Paper text:
The crystal structures of R273H and R273C incorporating covalently-bound MQ were determined at a resolution range of 1.71–2.05 Å from crystals with four independent p53DBD molecules. In the crystal structures obtained by the soaking procedure referred as R273H-MQ (I) and R273C-MQ (I), bound MQ has been identified at residues: C182, C229, C275 and C277 in both structures, as well as at C273 in R273C-MQ (I). MQ-C229 conjugates are observed solely in the crystal structures R273H-MQ (I) and R273C-MQ (I), obtained by the soaking procedure. Well-defined MQ-C275 conjugates are present in two p53 monomers of R273H-MQ (I) and one monomer of R273C-MQ (I). Bound MQs is observed in monomer A, and both enantiomers (with partial occupancy) in monomer D of R273H-MQ (I) (respectively). These conjugates form several stabilizing interactions, including hydrogen bonds made by the carbonyl oxygen and the tertiary amine of MQ with N239 and with S241 side chains, and with the backbone amide of A276. Additional MQ-mediated contacts include CH···O and VdW interactions with the side chains of Y107 and S106 from neighboring monomers, respectively. These interactions stabilize MQ-C275 conjugates in monomers A and D of R273H-MQ (I). Unlike the other MQ-modified Cys residues, the current MQ-C275 conjugates are not compatible with DNA binding because of their predicted close proximity to DNA. C277 is located at the protein-DNA interface and involved in base-specific interactions. MQ-C277 conjugates were identified in four monomers, one in each of the four crystal structures, shown in Fig. 4a–d.
Author numbering:
A (entry chain B): 97 to 287
B (entry chain A): 97 to 181, 185 to 288
C (entry chain D): 96 to 181, 185 to 223, 227 to 288
D (entry chain C): 96 to 182, 185 to 288
The structure:
């Protein structure tokens, strides 16, 4: 069972999220009170990476989903049989993988040989000129309600910073809810 | 014994029914308080499919009847001997038919022997918010050699083109001559 | 064409009554005899009393239906606005008028007029029977009533649907019924 | 692009009230009716009362936003100074000038098109017996902060909005944040 313990590590690795509000039309929104991201099926979910000092070149950024409830934590999070069916829009990603990265041609996907867990990794890139953080656009490819997939079970996304050799540099996590109206879901859950 | 657990699933699948009232002339009427449809032998029984987003083409909608009481739940629901003795498409033993759909498909489960009927899912028409399937029940709830006054539950399942279950809902049915009167009388309790 | 609004006391002497609630700031609903008009709040209890001179037979029913008062809008179906349509597990989301606290309530979408109504069994009483109506839209709801006055028509029907009596009253749904009634009665 | 500051009592008779705190030396906040101007200390409670003629619909929300008062600064976004905006933040974004204290349902917005900051809380009707609702605001920079407001006067705009975001009411007041509100109010009223 993968570790979810927060670790800023030596580079001061933290996650940030846009302050999007909860209007009805918002496509994603993060709740600080719940440390919970609310996003829509296969739509952009921006995650910011904040560091104290720049990690070495070749540093990588990995995302992995796990079930939040301890009696489900041993089950690998995957797409439901319905959505895992191949389509013409899978592109670079394995059809079973819940978490994709959008807009990064150097994305890499892993089925772990021993643990069978899915993850997606991209190169760490420093913020652009005039920016203080690096943003990754994740996509979640099932709904929280999917029968035969997550099946209403809550999940966490674990983001790890690792060096080119795979050693842990830092780790942080957040809960994710994938549904049609993130603004309403967040406003209702905070109530 | 097939599952009856309600799941809206990824597409927000739920059932809806016309608000038909209980006047004498009504040939079908649904009771929200009882989650129970009252309809007439071999007459139109419209069931609406409501979804929060559109399932892809190839999606299918299956209906199956089971007995509601656990004493009878392992017995296959079928027409009585009298009413078996068609439309050319439906097996004579099946209680539930779909009318007005040339793409209807009927299944005798090879292992459980249960009957079901399945049509392609079609999205709502222009201006409508739901898809309607016209079911026909081919036996009276009181048919001696069939249901014999035992209550039944109709299970509606949404499945994708590969057979994966997408969602499920159900309702009780009562088939008899005067649906309006039967719904009024049963709601007095 | 438009459903009849003409008063009819019928064989049972059917009339409506309303509480004499006054117009204090606290009142959640109040009826104006001078305007034959009920002032109530969104989704809150709006009590209507049924008065009869003799008891209707068992199986008698009581229907409520909203119609626009002005001749220019009389043929348009009164419905909830799109906002409020987006509850109780029994009422259709498009219906403006609900009945609260009656598990035997029945809702009708008329197959040919498309008009909405809500019906409950008539129960004998007290010296009157009370039905708690809820109005699920404001009178000013854009895309719904949109500041067009409505009437509620109350009909008494036998078990076979024959009319036994009919009465009506105007309805205004807004935030402060006491203030609204006092203001409208001033002018 | 500049938000409206036009006072709009709207259909519910929306008005702002303030405590009658006086100008003693030790007062931590004080409002000047003559100036329609609040004087408060950095990061200290600033009570603002909401008064309505009739109770707004369930799901109503109350938004606060700061803008510069002078015409030649009105297009600049009001934000915290670099010194103060360094990451006690709790639920609030570090760049936001205005926080709400003591409300776990608070929501912060970075407008995606205008880039302006605001903070929104649910409208709660007054408790049975009370005539008004109070929100506790905190201003997280001084008026004098170099790089931040940099001695420029600001207005706070309070908007009442329905659950869908439609304008129900608007009011505003000037704000001066400094160490001794009593002395600053008394002195500014001397002129
Ligand atoms: C953290 C970075 C920035 O500096 C701005 C706002 C959010 N990201 C991208 C642009
Ligand atoms: C659900 C749909 C609609 O939108 C109307 C009423 C019932 N069906 C067909 C037409
Ligand atoms: C319920 C059924 C019917 O449809 C008629 C009346 C009573 N039974 C037998 C015949
Ligand atoms: C008609 C009945 C009564 O007997 C009184 C007045 C109104 N309702 C309830 C109390
Ligand atoms: C009648 C209605 C209300 O409830 C408020 C005040 C006046 N109109 C519009 C909003
Ligand atoms: C005017 C209205 C009312 O009728 C009650 C008391 C004061 N406001 C809000 C609810
Ligand atoms: C659809 C299926 C294939 O045909 C290959 C590509 C994607 N998926 C696994 C192997
Ligand atoms: C509305 C305001 C008052 O009038 C006092 C009681 C409640 N609130 C604070 C002081
Ligand atoms: Zn899925
Ligand atoms: Zn039969
Ligand atoms: Zn409305
Ligand atoms: Zn500062």
């Amino acid at each position: 069972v993968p570790s979810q313990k927060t670790y800023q590590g030596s580079y001061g690795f933290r996650l940030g999220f846009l302050h999007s509000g909860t209007a009805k039309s918002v496509t994603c929104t993060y709740s600080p009170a719940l440390n919970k991201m609310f996003c829509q099926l296969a739509k952009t979910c921006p995650v910011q990476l904040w560091v104290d000092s720049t990690p070495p070149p070749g540093t990588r950024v990995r995302a992995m989903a796990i079930y939040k409830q301890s009696q489900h934590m041993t089950e690998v999070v995957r797409r439901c049989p319905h959505h895992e069916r191949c389509s013409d829009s899978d592109g670079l990603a394995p059809p079973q993988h819940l978490i994709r990265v959008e807009g990064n041609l150097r994305v890499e996907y892993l089925d772990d040989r021993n643990t069978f867990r899915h993850s997606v990794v991209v190169p760490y890139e420093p913020p652009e000129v005039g920016s203080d953080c690096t943003t990754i656009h994740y996509n979640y490819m099932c709904n929280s309600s999917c029968m035969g997939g997550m099946n209403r079970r809550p999940i966490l996304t674990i983001i790890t910073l690792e060096d080119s050799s795979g050693n842990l540099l830092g780790r942080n996590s957040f809960e994710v809810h994938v549904c049609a109206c993130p603004g309403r879901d967040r406003r209702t859950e905070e109530e």
